[PDB]
Amino acid sequence: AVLAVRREDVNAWERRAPLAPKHIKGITNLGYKVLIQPSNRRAIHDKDYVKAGGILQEDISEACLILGVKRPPAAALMSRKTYAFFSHTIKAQEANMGLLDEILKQEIRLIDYEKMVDHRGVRVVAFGQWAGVAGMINILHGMGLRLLALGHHTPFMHIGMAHNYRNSSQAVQAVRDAGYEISLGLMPKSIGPLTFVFTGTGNVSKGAQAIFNELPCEYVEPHELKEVSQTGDLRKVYGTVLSRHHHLVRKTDAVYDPAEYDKHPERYISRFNTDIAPYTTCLINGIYWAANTPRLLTRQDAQSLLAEGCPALPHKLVAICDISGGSIEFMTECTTIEHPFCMYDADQHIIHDSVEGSGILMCSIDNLPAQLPIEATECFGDMLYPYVEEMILSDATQPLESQNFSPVVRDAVITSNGTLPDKYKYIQTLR
Amino acid sequence: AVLAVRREDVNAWERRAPLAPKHIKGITNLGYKVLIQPSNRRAIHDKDYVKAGGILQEDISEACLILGVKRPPAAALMSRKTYAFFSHTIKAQEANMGLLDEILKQEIRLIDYEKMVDHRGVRVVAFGQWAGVAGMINILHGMGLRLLALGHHTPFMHIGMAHNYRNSSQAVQAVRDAGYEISLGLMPKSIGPLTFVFTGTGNVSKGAQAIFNELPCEYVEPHELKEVSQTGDLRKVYGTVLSRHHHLVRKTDAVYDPAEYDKHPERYISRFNTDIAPYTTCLINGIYWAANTPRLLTRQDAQSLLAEGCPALPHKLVAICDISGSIEFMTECTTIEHPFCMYDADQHIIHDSVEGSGILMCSIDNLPAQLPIEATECFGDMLYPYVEEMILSDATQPLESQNFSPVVRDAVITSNGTLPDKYKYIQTLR
Ligand SMILES: [Mg+2]
């Protein structure tokens, strides 16, 4: 019963860990030995895990359970062990198919965080609200550069990228300082009031709203967005939270039924393109798109939206940041931490790593919580902590049926004893 | 006698102004009318100039003197006026030749800030130390990214670009906070102590040292860098200021004579490549290169410099930042948008990258634009005493009848319709 936290080596920006020092202290209190593989890449220093009771050691062959965040290289895999990380093999991705064979060859039991769900189907291990926190900092930083490219200096120029701040607290202070300048009237008058639209009910939307609340903000209802976009006070920023009933209407009767939409989303359409989009400066998209869910904006909608010293904006919509996705059809490509922003012009072509031109600024980062890795690590570790003890007690050599697993851990096992279970047998047929 | 401050439209990053509101208040106190062309690009808001006494007006045809920072577009030029900006036509630059003839056609008097000098030859109007302040913030930000690409999370990751901060004070707070983490021991042990070398005696070198003083720094002599580079405390950063006598020696006897080096720099060489460079993590170059001054580093010197969970640095030298020809292998310059480039052992430069085994290099032509408010106040303070004589000038009257000081007078490039004798060579140089 020995636990090891492996070093992340997927990419340079993976500074997170599956467990935080306070979680390691709890595991050592239960009587389990925890090995910590040294890593200069992790945002939490090795000395903090030593204080919690972990042992700094390169050789983690002693451990039967190896915890990581992202996929490990094939050569690093140790045979006859239990590994837990994000495999991204659920859709039989070719890149991770070379990894999957080594796990089967080494007779490794693999638990995937993404498959861990409760009885209602909600994932029980995730990074919480921090993707929204990081997304809001980035999009405010991107709007400063985009507005400067259009010729307007704004206080948003004084907000850096999310990864430029030690933690969310230091970023909050920077947001307040830029907000102070806005309340002082340092915004350019010709661009008009700025309106922020938040979509979704998940934790990422609340995290994005938390950063927004540090600005001089006033929340208005969606139907008021038309009014505020023209007569709003320039010493404030305006925000609105989009709910289902605000924009979803039936194709037949334009009626919204909460129970019917959840069971039958194919019968509904979205009025976001005409009711909200023309009066939106910045869209923060947190909607988790499901089967037959209507899209907020289409390529046809973008064509409608895209048409001396102090010029006005060419179009009201400046930027869109998705913090959770198919909701926006013309957002076909994703950005990275290194190149956070791209432009979608009226010619329906994407200019990557640019804030210039007449297009719409777009931001779509797949690993937003990596920009706030310390706070993301504690949040992830809090969710994973209750399931850790049953994972350490697992034995990679014994069959799955003899293991004392809960349904959350059991259904998440992709590989075990060299062979894929029935529920994941389909992977082999999918290339 | 009407003065106007034109709107900057050279590039998106030109947020500076030739005069600050506090300077406009003094000019209005003298009784002169000041027009302010509205500009969303300016870092200082239009209302602050209105408070100082300026008048917000798009049409500045009433003014006889138009002050800007950088070049205006040719179409915007108003005939029979006096303009003051950086023209960059003294060396007959191809790009600005189309501007220069247009100025001659409009019969405009052009004063160039860079040509304004004192009797000793020192420029009297400049942006001061702020280029060095911005350069130090950027290079610390670049070292965090470069070290992360090498596999090391560092507190330098928590320092942004200069243009991400409202002023130098907010940047100082971030540098202090990263310094706190260094003093707490959060730096990775495997990379070892970090050594910073500052060169030059100009104002920009002093500005970069000011940001460095906010870190947990210990200053050592340049020759001590060899010892500290191995046994230095990992909770401190180490810096040294390079003087002439430390690295400059004559070829024949290895002796340094201050008076002779100034008169005959060709007789001297620099051993910085062997005595200090191998033990330098980050080089901040502020030396102003002269005719026969020896080079600090050569391409062959770079070839000599370029050769499990906690890896060591591939080579001691990580980054070089130029804040001012001293370094030949720095053949290309970077921009604010793409601040860093890598010079590899293959002698090819990969721009906008912090990855690979090369040497990270940063060389921005307009560093003060990242701190435009403080750069505007410094530039305006130097220009303010010469402003009044420019307002009294008349573009239609001959240059010889104008009451100009020698500083302003020699800086007139175009005068009335034809270039003066001192600038006659420009047309023949094309
Ligand atoms: Mg970049």
Short mmCIF file of C-alpha atoms and ligand atoms in Angstrom, two decimals, chain A residues 338-340 353, chain B residues 337-339 352, ligand 1:
data_model
loop_
_atom_site.label_atom_id
_atom_site.label_comp_id
_atom_site.label_asym_id
_atom_site.label_seq_id
_atom_site.Cartn_x
_atom_site.Cartn_y
_atom_site.Cartn_z
CA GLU A 338 1.21 30.38 -25.86
CA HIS A 339 -1.10 31.76 -28.60
CA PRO A 340 -4.33 32.62 -26.75
CA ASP A 353 -2.11 34.55 -32.91
CA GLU B 337 4.24 42.00 -29.90
CA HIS B 338 6.98 39.33 -30.29
CA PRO B 339 9.49 40.26 -27.58
CA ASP B 352 8.82 34.53 -31.22
MG MG C 1 3.22 36.04 -28.20
#
